[PDB]
């Protein structure tokens, strides 16, 4: 395909000249090799799965950790290249067929990272020496306060959950409610607070959470948004 | 080593043998102590298309890649060898294909 | 990056994945027969077929994205 590329650019007049330039390994050869590799898939074989190669520095083949002496193969015909790209990609095969079990699930460091990411607050006796938190109006204010070292990853905070649908719960009745004489009341729960009134309506939920939990939710929401950006 | 060198981070009594260490790209400490050492490290010294790959490719139904890998990447000439050796055992492995249009029994080149 | 969502869209469009991929291979080989421009550099016939088909779906993708 490098020879065919050198013919396509007319930089070699015959296949022997193309082979001679390939032997000379001049930068032109690597530019045409980058042109050839662009959009051409290859099979990797341990266990046999196909990927888009990208020309990389060094000499040892580089593989993605979740897809991880691998052998390498080029599909030669156009029908084979089509079948490879449309059937044989990891995108097409995220499920193990034996029951339909997701293969690529976060594992090793990432999972324990996510575990710590989602460990969040120290609870109760582990958090206060004796028996007896900021509010953030949106999650980017909380992340900003974390970056500015006003709060730590483990530390409890309140986020205004103005998307006041989709509140998570444990089927637990309110741990406490406060009613003001003027008919506002606050419901306090082990995980969140709701301010609502007999006149007017619910003002806001405030969820008691951590920078870690916020980041876990936000980076998935922003991954969905980043993918669906192309839907525009 | 700590008290002789006055390096109190070498033996931190709170978590002996571990120490807090810093990100060279940030200068902030990683918030949990990291185990540190000077261990002794040694530098170490330094295409078959397999049947289970055939089974996997045909499981994907990706059979044109399977055809490529088993034929023109190296009837196929190895099937010619197979038929020739059976023909040398005095067995005629005879390959026919039937015309859907004409029912003609075309003998394959074998 | 994005092109595989188009692939998935077309996989979702066609009623048989294998028949879809057969039709893509057919379209590419008839393209490379009805036109004999070399068309083999930074853009590839498979991506061209996927692009034209997603443009039939109405979506603003250029030839080979």
């Amino acid at each position: 395909f490098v020879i065919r590329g050198l013919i396509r650019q007319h930089l070699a007049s015959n296949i022997g000249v193309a082979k001679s330039q390939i032997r000379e390994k001049k930068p032109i050869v690597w530019e045409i090799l980058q042109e050839v590799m662009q959009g051409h898939p290859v099979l990797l074989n341990r266990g046999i799965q196909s990927f888009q190669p990208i020309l990389v520095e060094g000499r040892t083949i580089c593989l993605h950790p979740l897809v991880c002496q691998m052998a390498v193969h080029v599909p030669l015909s156009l029908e084979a290249q089509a079948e490879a790209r449309l059937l044989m990609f990891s995108h097409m095969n995220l499920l193990s067929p034996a029951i339909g079990d997701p293969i690529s699930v976060p594992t090793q460091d990432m999972l324990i990272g996510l575990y710590v990411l989602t460990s969040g607050t120290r609870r109760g006796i582990c958090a206060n020496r004796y028996n007896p938190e900021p509010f953030f109006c949106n999650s980017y204010d909380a992340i900003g306060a974390y970056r500015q070292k006003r709060i730590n990853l483990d530390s409890p905070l309140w986020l205004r959950w103005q998307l006041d649908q989709r509140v998570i719960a444990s089927k637990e009745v309110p741990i406490e409610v406060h009613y003001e004489s003027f008919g506002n009341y606050h419901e306090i729960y082990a995980h969140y607070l709701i301010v609502r009134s007999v006149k007017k309506e619910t003002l806001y939920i405030y969820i008691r959470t951590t920078v870690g939990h916020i980041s876990f939710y936000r980076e998935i929401e922003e991954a969905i948004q980043g993918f669906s950006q192309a839907c525009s | 080593a700590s008290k002789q060198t006055a390096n109190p981070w070498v033996f931190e009594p709170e978590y002996p043998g571990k120490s807090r260490i810093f990100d060279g790209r940030t200068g902030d400490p990683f918030e949990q102590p990291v185990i540190i050492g000077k261990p002794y490290i040694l530098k170490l010294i330094h295409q078959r298309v397999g049947e289970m790959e055939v089974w996997a490719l045909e499981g994907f139904g990706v059979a044109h890649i399977l055809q490529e890998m088993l034929t023109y990447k190296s009837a196929p000439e190895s099937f010619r060898l197979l038929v020739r050796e059976l023909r040398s055992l005095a067995l005629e492995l005879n390959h026919f294909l039937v015309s859907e249009k004409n029912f003609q029994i075309n003998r394959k080149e074998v | 990056k994005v092109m595989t969502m188009d692939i998935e869209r077309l996989l979702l469009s066609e009623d048989n994945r294998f028949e879809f991929v057969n039709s893509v291979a057919a379209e590419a080989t008839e393209y490379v027969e009805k036109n004999r421009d070399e068309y083999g550099g930074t853009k590839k016939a498979i991506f061209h077929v996927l692009s034209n088909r997603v443009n039939d779906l109405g979506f603003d993708r250029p030839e080979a994205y």
């Binding site: 079948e83 | 045909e58 994907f60 139904g61 059979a63 044109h64 | -």
Partner: peptide
């Protein structure tokens, strides 16, 4: 697979 027919 692809070569169903």
């Amino acid at each position: 697979g692809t070569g169903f027919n």
